[PDB]
Design an enzyme around this catalytic site. Structure first.
Site, short mmCIF file in Angstrom:
data_model
loop_
_atom_site.label_atom_id
_atom_site.label_comp_id
_atom_site.label_asym_id
_atom_site.label_seq_id
_atom_site.Cartn_x
_atom_site.Cartn_y
_atom_site.Cartn_z
N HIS A 1 -7.87 21.06 5.84
CA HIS A 1 -6.78 20.29 5.26
C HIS A 1 -5.51 20.60 6.06
O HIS A 1 -5.50 21.51 6.89
CB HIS A 1 -6.55 20.71 3.79
CG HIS A 1 -7.74 20.52 2.90
ND1 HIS A 1 -8.01 19.31 2.29
CD2 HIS A 1 -8.65 21.44 2.49
CE1 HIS A 1 -9.06 19.53 1.52
NE2 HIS A 1 -9.49 20.80 1.61
N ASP B 1 1.37 16.57 5.52
CA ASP B 1 2.29 15.67 6.19
C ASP B 1 3.38 15.34 5.16
O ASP B 1 3.08 14.96 4.04
CB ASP B 1 1.50 14.40 6.62
CG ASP B 1 2.39 13.22 7.03
OD1 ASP B 1 3.63 13.27 6.93
OD2 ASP B 1 1.82 12.19 7.46
N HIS C 1 6.72 13.08 4.35
CA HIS C 1 7.43 11.88 4.75
C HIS C 1 8.93 12.20 4.92
O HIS C 1 9.71 11.39 5.41
CB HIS C 1 7.25 10.77 3.70
CG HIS C 1 5.90 10.11 3.74
ND1 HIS C 1 5.62 8.88 3.19
CD2 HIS C 1 4.74 10.53 4.31
CE1 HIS C 1 4.34 8.59 3.43
NE2 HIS C 1 3.76 9.56 4.10
N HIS D 1 1.49 14.29 1.76
CA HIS D 1 0.06 14.18 1.54
C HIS D 1 -0.73 14.80 2.68
O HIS D 1 -0.23 14.93 3.80
CB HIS D 1 -0.36 12.71 1.36
CG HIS D 1 -0.10 11.85 2.57
ND1 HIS D 1 -0.90 11.81 3.69
CD2 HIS D 1 0.94 11.02 2.83
CE1 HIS D 1 -0.34 10.98 4.59
NE2 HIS D 1 0.79 10.48 4.11
N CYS D 2 -1.96 15.17 2.37
CA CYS D 2 -2.87 15.74 3.35
C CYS D 2 -3.28 14.57 4.25
O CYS D 2 -3.33 13.42 3.80
CB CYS D 2 -4.08 16.32 2.61
SG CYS D 2 -5.41 16.89 3.70
N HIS E 1 -8.96 12.12 1.75
CA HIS E 1 -8.28 13.25 1.14
C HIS E 1 -7.18 12.75 0.24
O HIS E 1 -7.00 13.29 -0.87
CB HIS E 1 -7.68 14.16 2.19
CG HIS E 1 -8.68 15.02 2.90
ND1 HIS E 1 -8.51 16.38 3.02
CD2 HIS E 1 -9.85 14.66 3.48
CE1 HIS E 1 -9.58 16.82 3.66
NE2 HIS E 1 -10.42 15.81 3.96
N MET F 1 -4.98 14.44 -3.14
CA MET F 1 -4.25 15.37 -2.31
C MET F 1 -2.93 14.79 -1.83
O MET F 1 -2.76 14.48 -0.65
CB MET F 1 -5.12 15.84 -1.15
CG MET F 1 -4.78 17.23 -0.73
SD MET F 1 -6.08 18.11 0.15
CE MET F 1 -5.21 19.64 0.47
N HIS G 1 7.26 0.37 -15.23
CA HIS G 1 8.00 -0.34 -16.25
C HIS G 1 8.01 0.51 -17.51
O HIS G 1 6.99 1.08 -17.89
CB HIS G 1 7.31 -1.69 -16.50
CG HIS G 1 7.80 -2.42 -17.71
ND1 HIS G 1 8.79 -3.37 -17.65
CD2 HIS G 1 7.41 -2.37 -19.01
CE1 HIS G 1 8.99 -3.89 -18.85
NE2 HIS G 1 8.16 -3.30 -19.69
N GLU H 1 13.79 -4.30 -14.87
CA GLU H 1 12.78 -4.35 -15.93
C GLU H 1 11.51 -3.73 -15.36
O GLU H 1 10.90 -2.88 -15.97
CB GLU H 1 12.52 -5.80 -16.40
CG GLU H 1 11.79 -6.74 -15.41
CD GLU H 1 11.67 -8.17 -15.93
OE1 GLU H 1 10.98 -8.38 -16.96
OE2 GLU H 1 12.27 -9.08 -15.32
N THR H 2 11.19 -4.12 -14.13
CA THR H 2 10.03 -3.64 -13.40
C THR H 2 10.41 -3.59 -11.93
O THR H 2 11.09 -4.50 -11.44
CB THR H 2 8.85 -4.61 -13.60
OG1 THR H 2 8.50 -4.62 -14.99
CG2 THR H 2 7.65 -4.20 -12.77
N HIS I 1 3.01 -2.12 -14.41
CA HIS I 1 2.97 -3.45 -15.01
C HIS I 1 1.95 -4.51 -14.56
O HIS I 1 2.20 -5.71 -14.70
CB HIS I 1 4.37 -4.03 -15.19
CG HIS I 1 4.54 -4.82 -16.45
ND1 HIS I 1 3.94 -6.04 -16.69
CD2 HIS I 1 5.30 -4.56 -17.54
CE1 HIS I 1 4.34 -6.48 -17.88
NE2 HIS I 1 5.17 -5.62 -18.45
CU LIG Z 1 -7.02 17.61 2.51
CU LIG Z 2 1.98 9.14 4.93
CU LIG Z 3 5.85 -6.06 -20.33
#
Ligand SMILES: [Cu+2]
Ligand SMILES: [Cu+2]
Ligand SMILES: [Cu+2]
Ligand SMILES: [Cu+2]
Ligand SMILES: [Cu+2]
Ligand SMILES: [Cu+2]
Lengths: 333, 333, 333
Positions: B88, B91, B93, B128-129, B138, B143, B248, B272-273, B299
């Site tokens: 594993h 990473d 962001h 994330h891995c 993964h 993960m 939502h 709202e969403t 939603h």
């Molecule tokens: Cu992993």
């Molecule tokens: Cu990524």
């Molecule tokens: Cu709704």
């Protein structure tokens, strides 16, 4: 009026590269002339040799990126050689009227036409073939590209200060729906038409068999990876004429992003991933700060690593340990 | 230059909870040390006892939320104990360079490593891995997690004024692709490796069998519902490392929303969403005005109520009949 | 407080049309009264005679668009006649508390209720049925609509300047999941209940069989096309209560767009295509400049041309050659 404007014939360049142009318009409105030839052709889209009947603008998937300035007039000479089998046309999302120009450019094999429209809105737009009745078939067969209408004064940041790119790349993402038999083996056809019935059925599943950048799995990797150097400002135009995508540069960010690609709107800053809706072209501006390999992917990792929507960036320069460093390299506990 | 910075060791809390932290930074930049142990383990994801081999950061899905301030240095000690079977890495962001750190943190069972990077951009980011060759596997195994990089001066609204939250919760949405047999019954495997071939096939359909919050159907309901009271300002961090989602709050709204999670951008009001693209983390701020039960959902109602993406909020307080009321009809004027 | 306020009764109109209203408020807060009768009925959704048991608000799919001003009180009398067979309710994304009203509006056949709620936030919102346990089923059966809460001073552009539309249309997009037999033939049932078990199995595939505007394929085509004239400013409210869509006006644009539909935020300018997340309503403002036929579509072209999400706009007026002209009509090379 038009009879008086200066004309400029542009020589197109194949993706991911872009033809010569000024970011800041050095002259007033012009009539920018382009010529593109339609070409139906067999294309191998992956390592396993899967073949399809691609319909292209200028022999590439995606079609070449066209660049003009706000208020310029675009005059496109569209040629459909008699070697082709289908009728095609072209619709520009940047144009106003006649279905984006699609209703005025229907050409059968052995025909050509010349359309002119005014680029009244700045931004990167999608253009695609849209024949009455088989619109999705022509678009999902690679018959789409993009056009960038830059503001006469170039790009500006969230505060109105000018942004100048050193390099510009065009990445067209294409979703393919290749028909399969019972076992799961991809089908091969002699002509496009033979493939039509099976194509419609495959499309209706709404699940692509392939999602690729620049026409093929790994098309933008290895010796074909995009290049840059630390300190360079790069603009990446990304388009998807039929399906949503969520671009992400692994190891970097989108410093300035116009997710829906329209320049009159201020850009979104520091995006890790942004969503570009199907039928839209967007742009991301980044300045490289670290050397090495970066992956440019569709952040639905299944679509990126299993379906093919992944490319590379090879950056040169000196590593900056302040930004990141390995304090303890991997070793047995 | 870095040796003059204070170093602080932080103990991570299991989601939806977050470790203590100041919204407005009281000290200058620091080196914040975190430790995470990788744990591969079987996890029951639904009421029917469906079990999977989860690959987790610190024993949970999602991994814990890390909170630091803009320009702090994050120093992570990643441990992969010998009880695990797979290689594993991690990473971020939020990091710049080396595939987010992924290229520098590859650890086999029995290895560990320490990475340091500068959190140069404010916002909530996904981590994330990402092992070469098995990235989507993964990640869809749980993960993944998030890290919040707070601006040194806290959150600000559309007009630059302070936004202070009384509570913060981290909701990690996870799409699973569990393999079934011919009838539709979920498979069970002895080791993660055994599941691999079937997992890939299941992922390629692009159709999740489950979409859950905090690793299981109903993980955030009943005795586990998120709590708040009328008058409290709550910040809800929401991440999805691989697939689009659209949060939502049923019965409420997202007063200030950073759908793409980057704080240098002004928030969107009265949502709202909102759409959070796959591979992104977002944040919503809301002040509760009515007591009662609230449902926090993705939603796409099918994904929320059929596949599992739904949680609860239990708010205490006094009802405001001016906002809403069941009308009594004894009158005409 | 409410007792002393002016009350105005409004007779709803069937979509795509909208009831009379003022953009700029000529009075202070008001109690606007609406009446809606629930109707469960069979509906034919395609040219092939496919039939489903739709659950509608006022006999249509989508339900009528309700229009009020910010700070007005909405008083809705909801009637569930004894001819219906299911329990229903209503949830407004525009209201605060009690799950948007759903917790206060559960009615069995033969019952009615009157809910009142303050419209505190301006923008276009979705409203839909949400019975505990069968939420997705009721929404996907067509039980959804939208409410527009206009700012008391009307719409404004990016610079705070007034925006006045001459025409307003309401397009509700619906994703249907019609159950199929082994060959792929759509099923028919005697009552809504009979279809339940199958409906759930069809929904869980996350793949619609149909995606239509205003209830059926071609509901907004031919003699039902939306109409306008060159020079008219049109506002198109578009809603999707369960699934993502990406509207696009072929041959036009979205001059001012509120993709997520909340008016306190500035609109995005010059959009070619915009994303409306499921569970949201958006609005696009456009001034027609060229006459002719325009296609209003969901830009996932497969969804638009194969599944049904396509409509028309027939626009009158004189052609503008400056904006677009055929320099050389298609001719043999
Ligand atoms: Cu992993
Ligand atoms: Cu990524
Ligand atoms: Cu709704
Ligand atoms: Cu074509
Ligand atoms: Cu188009
Ligand atoms: Cu209902």
């Amino acid at each position: 009026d038009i009879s008086t404007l200066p004309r400029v014939k542009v020589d197109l360049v194949k993706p991911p590269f872009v033809h010569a142009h000024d970011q800041v318009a050095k002259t007033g409105p012009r009539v920018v002339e382009f010529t593109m030839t339609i070409e139906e052709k067999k294309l191998v889209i992956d390592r396993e040799g899967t073949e399809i009947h691609a319909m292209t603008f200028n022999g590439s998937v995606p079609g070449p990126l066209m660049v003009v300035h706000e208020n310029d007039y675009v005059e496109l000479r569209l040629i459909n050689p008699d070697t082709n089998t289908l009728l095609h046309n072209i619709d520009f999302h940047a144009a106003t009227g006649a279905l984006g120009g699609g209703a005025l450019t229907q050409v059968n094999p052995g025909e050509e036409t010349t359309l002119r429209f005014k680029a009244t809105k700045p931004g990167v737009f999608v253009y695609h073939c849209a024949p009455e009745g088989m619109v999705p078939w022509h678009v999902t067969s690679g018959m789409n590209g993009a056009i960038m209408v830059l503001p006469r004064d170039g790009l500006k940041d969230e505060k109105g200060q000018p942004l100048t790119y050193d390099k510009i790349y065009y990445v067209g993402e294409q979703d393919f729906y290749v028909p399969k038999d019972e076992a799961g083996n991809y089908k091969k056809y002699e002509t496009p038409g033979e493939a039509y019935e099976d194509a419609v059925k495959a499309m209706r599943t709404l699940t692509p068999t392939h999602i690729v950048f620049n026409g093929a799995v790994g098309a933008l990797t290895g010796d074909h990876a995009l290049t840059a150097a630390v300190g360079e400002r790069v603009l990446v135009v990304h388009s998807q004429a039929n399906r949503d995508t969520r671009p992400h540069l692994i190891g970097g960010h989108g410093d300035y992003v116009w997710a829906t690609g329209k320049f009159r709107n201020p850009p979104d800053l520091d995006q890790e991933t942004w969503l570009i809706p199907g039928g839209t072209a967007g742009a991301a501006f980044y300045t490289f700060r670290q050397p090495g390999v970066y992956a440019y992917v569709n952040h639905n990792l299944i679509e990126a690593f299993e379906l093919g929507a992944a490319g590379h960036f090879k950056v040169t320069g000196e590593w900056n340990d302040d930004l990141m460093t390995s304090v303890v390299k991997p070793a047995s506990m």
